[PDB]
Design a protein around this ligand. Structure first.
Ligand SMILES: [Zn+2]
Length: 456
């Protein structure tokens, strides 16, 4: 029950209400929470002191959109250069083929999730929201049990987002029977996950969310169902939003825009955060803001699939909450959140070539990846380095040869480096990474183990 001190951090970016940063400053930790943040803190009831000299400290990075099972589908030649239609077809084909061959059961997904989630810690990420849409079995399998087990083993903070594809071919589905479950089955299963796994109190380490694949992949009945369950059980809602093909297929299926659909079926609320949001009509943006929905920027896939640049500046001008994510490793193909910020830093600029003020800055992006994502997930206890918040902390060394000459360390973190490896990482007050190595997890064993279970 004794405390931890991180002394002499070169720089501490807090993302509190003032955007306070501190130099040569400390973080005092008591169990799961941050006791204090400032210069020269007392080491009185302290049982361990850690030298932060030459490090920048940020709140733990929070990846607000993952598909862990896709770590098994990395760098596939046939999928290197495909449009979404071929990509989606190729992923489902593979996951389906592997499953019924017996090579893709929960025990496999568990070890795939273990590796990617460990990669996540190693990249400064302390919270991950995974969206798992793949439930064949006919009793809904224990895939989410499997990812929760991996996360819990490793000590990373975790949001399981129960996903699906309830709208089949005969209903206008571009999906498959195998993966089409009845709404009630999806609803019943979610109820059980909440009762069993959901930790609604401050500093909760596992939380359940409800997440249809999308407005054109799921029955409107599921959206209304989840909207009731979210109010009743006080959990959050998640889905994909304004992918380029959506506004076309939504209108074909419902004669309305995806936003209008969400609004009808109870999802224009502050319990909702939304993935990608690449191509909305501009007139709806002020409606996103009044409704209090959050959005997650996912640059690597939006680029990987040819989709382009989501109007992130417009969301920020509108006062909409923006978070950040990597999406799955079949369209990234990494879980490197930090590296992905450099992508967003650079690729937005050609769209406003003469208005650099519009361009996203390093500090806006880091905010997205911490406090922005915290608010996507409805975690007022995360994403900020201040007393009373969770002791979720990620630190990077600034004294490498690849970062000589850096004038601002926050900007340098995005714009320079041969490596995005974090040095020190603290989740829930537990040191899980030190000297860029896992302190509790066995890295080599995990790598050999997971590698042996990857389907050919
Ligand atoms: Zn996704």
């Amino acid at each position: 029950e004794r405390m931890i001190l991180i002394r002499g951090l070169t720089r501490v970016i807090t993302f509190d209400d003032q955007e306070r940063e501190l130099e040569d400053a400390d973080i005092l930790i008591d169990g799961p929470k941050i006791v204090a943040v400032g210069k020269n803190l007392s080491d009185r009831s302290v049982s361990r002191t850690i030298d932060g000299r030459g490090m920048i400290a940020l709140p733990g990075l929070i990846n607000s959109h993952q598909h862990l099972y896709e770590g098994a589908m990395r760098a596939i030649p046939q999928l290197e250069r495909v449009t979404m239609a071929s990509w989606l077809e190729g992923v489902l084909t593979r996951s389906a083929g592997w499953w019924r061959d017996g090579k893709f059961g929960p025990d496999v997904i568990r070890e795939v999730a273990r590796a990617v989630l460990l990669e996540s810690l190693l990249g400064g990420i302390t919270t991950v929201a995974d969206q798992h849409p793949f439930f064949p079995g006919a009793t809904a399998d224990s895939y989410i049990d499997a990812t929760i087990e991996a996360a819990t083993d490793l000590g990373i903070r975790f949001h399981a987002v129960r996903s699906s594809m309830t709208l089949g071919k005969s209903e206008g589905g571009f999906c498959d029977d195998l993966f089409v479950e009845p709404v009630d089955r999806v609803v019943q299963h979610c109820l059980g996950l909440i009762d069993q796994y959901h930790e609604p109190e401050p500093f909760g380490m596992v939380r359940i969310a409800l997440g249809p694949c999308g407005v054109t992949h799921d029955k409107p009945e599921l959206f209304e169902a989840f909207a009731q369950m979210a109010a009743d059980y006080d959990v959050r809602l998640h889905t994909h939003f304004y992918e380029p093909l959506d506004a076309g297929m939504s209108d074909h299926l419902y004669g309305m825009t995806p936003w209008r659909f969400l609004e009808k079926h109870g999802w224009a609320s502050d319990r909702v955060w939304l993935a990608h949001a690449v191509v909305p009509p501009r007139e709806e943006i002020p409606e996103f803001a009044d409704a209090g929905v959050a959005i997650a920027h996912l640059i690597a896939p939006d680029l990987r699939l040819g989709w382009g640049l989501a109007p992130i500046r417009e969301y920020l001008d509108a006062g909409i909450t923006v978070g950040f994510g990597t999406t799955g490793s079949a369209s990234n193909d990494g879980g490197n959140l930090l590296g992905d910020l450099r992508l967003a830093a650079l690729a937005h600029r050609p769209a406003d070539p003469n208005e650099p003020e519009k361009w996203l800055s390093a500090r806006e992006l880091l905010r997205m990846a911490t406090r922005g994502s915290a608010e996507c997930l409805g975690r007022p206890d995360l994403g900020v380095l201040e007393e009373g918040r969770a002791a979720d902390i990620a630190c990077w060394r600034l004294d490498g040869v690849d970062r000589v000459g850096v004038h601002d360390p926050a900007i340098g973190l995005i714009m320079t480096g041969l490596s995005d490896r974090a040095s020190l990482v603290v989740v829930n007050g537990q040191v899980l990474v030190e000297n860029e190595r896992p302190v509790l997890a066995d890295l080599e064993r995990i790598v050999a183990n997971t590698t042996a279970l990857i389907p050919k």
